[PDB]
């Protein structure tokens, strides 16, 4: 014999060390071994924290926000059980995404009156789209149905940003910035001031106050406070003049051409322009901090990496630049595209870039070493992509691709085969959404990986 229940007999920390050397499958089986083993495993937070981190379902910095969200969802479970349930759900979903023989359920819904969709937000069980038909459409991603259409813009909608609690902000060719309440189904505020098309926008929170920042073809950016919710009007509250607008903060002048892209966090906001430069702003002081010069052509996309205090810029000059926002200095120039680089995304571990030649590049989010490289086979310009540490989904004319970033392999190339264009793609967990064009019409596609 000489057999011994080592897991029970050993001190807790040591048996814990043993479970950390196991894959999740073995840990799951171990839960069914005996009451004591069951008790020992469900005792440690770290065990499930490590597994969640190791599968890129969460980062160390994101852990607290995950825990709170889990507490809200499962009020009557221990932290350990919350983390275990979260892990099992996430690993189940991921396996479906990775299984080339898995096929998601598909829901196809009417899009806009025009075939081109210009912007899409996917947050809080809402899918929200804008187009040149002057309309904003809101969808329920849980029941996978159309909810309502938000009308009011006198021009096409070209920028959208979801805030919180069914509140959203839009920018249009009518030069207005509009605040909407989904649950009231109306526009609550119309902010005028821009002298040209509102091209882009972002929302930041600094000292528990949300601000709207809007870039325009008038070479400027306008800063506005996001209005608070009401308790117990003449909606929409129209503000024809900025100085007489209590939600108006000020104008940020600096660029000599259209403000194409904007990215902010806290009091720091970065703008990119067709004048080949970027500016780092302090919207608390309403002052220019740095001017990032060096690109030889239009800036199409920028990301403010606030975690590392850096700026990433993508240009028509085919280059990507990394800037140190502690001193305003150039850090790196990345050369991995031979065409306009107009799309950037940052996940916890990957900076991802996509170009007009159909190329997509993955760079390490910290040292920018080359992690992956993809190319749409028809060499059509990348119109949209979305990415996590585990999955890349990309779109272009006649192509919609899902890539496994671990194995580097294409999982699915034909899920949205009937689409002619992919205007916008976004995913979170079990849900993947795409605004597409097919035979001269726009549609919203919803893919379910549960």
């Amino acid at each position: 014999n000489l057999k011994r229940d080592l897991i029970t007999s050993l001190p807790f920390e040591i048996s814990l060390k043993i479970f950390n050397y196991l894959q999740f499958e073995d840990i799951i089986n171990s839960l069914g071994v005996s009451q004591n083993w069951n008790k020992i495993i469900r005792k440690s937070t770290s065990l499930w924290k490590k597994l969640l981190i190791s599968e890129n379902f969460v980062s160390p910095k994101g852990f607290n926000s995950l825990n709170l969200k889990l507490s809200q969802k499962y009020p009557k479970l221990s932290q350990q059980d919350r983390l275990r349930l979260s892990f099992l759900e996430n690993i189940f979903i991921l396996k479906n995404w990775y299984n080339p023989k898995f096929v998601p359920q598909r829901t196809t819904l009417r899009g806009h009156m025009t075939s081109v969709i210009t912007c899409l937000q996917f947050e809080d069980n809402y899918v929200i789209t804008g187009a040149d038909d002057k309309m904003i459409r809101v969808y329920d991603s849980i029941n996978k149905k159309f909810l309502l259409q938000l009308s009011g813009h006198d021009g096409g909608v070209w920028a959208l940003k979801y805030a919180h609690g069914g509140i959203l902000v839009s920018g249009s060719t009518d030069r207005t910035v509009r605040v909407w309440d989904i649950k009231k189904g109306c526009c609550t505020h119309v902010f005028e001031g821009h002298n040209s098309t509102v091209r882009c926008l972002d929302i930041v929170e600094y000292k528990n106050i949300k601000y709207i920042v809007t870039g325009s073809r008038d070479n400027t950016l306008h800063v506005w406070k996001l209005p608070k919710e009401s308790s117990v009007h003449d909606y929409p509250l129209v503000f024809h003049t900025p100085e007489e607008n209590p939600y108006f903060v000020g104008v940020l002048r600096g660029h000599m051409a259209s403000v194409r892209t904007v990215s902010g966090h806290g009091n720091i906001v970065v703008s990119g322009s067709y004048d080949n430069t970027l500016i780092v702003w302090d919207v608390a002081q309403m002052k220019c901090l740095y001017i990032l010069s060096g690109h030889t052509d239009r800036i199409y996309s920028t990301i403010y990496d606030h975690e590392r205090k850096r700026c990433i810029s993508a240009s028509m000059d085919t280059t990507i630049r990394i800037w140190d926002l502690e001193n305003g200095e150039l850090m790196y120039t990345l050369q991995g595209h031979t065409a306009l680089v107009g799309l950037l995304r940052l996940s916890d571990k990957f900076l991802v870039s996509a170009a007009a030649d159909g190329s997509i590049r993955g760079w390490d989010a910290n040292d920018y070493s080359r992690k992956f490289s993809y190319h749409h086979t028809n060499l059509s310009a990348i119109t949209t992509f979305y990415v996590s540490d585990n999955i890349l989904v990309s779109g272009s004319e006649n192509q919609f691709n899902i890539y496994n970033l671990r194995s580097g392999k294409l999982v699915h190339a034909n899920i949205l085969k009937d689409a002619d264009q992919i205007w916008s793609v976004n995913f979170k967990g079990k849900t993947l959404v795409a605004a597409v064009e097919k035979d001269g019409q726009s549609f919203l596609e919803i893919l379910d990986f549960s």
Partner: peptide
Amino acid sequence: FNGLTSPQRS
């Protein structure tokens, strides 16, 4: 086509 739709001039 560069993949990025743009509004038309005002």
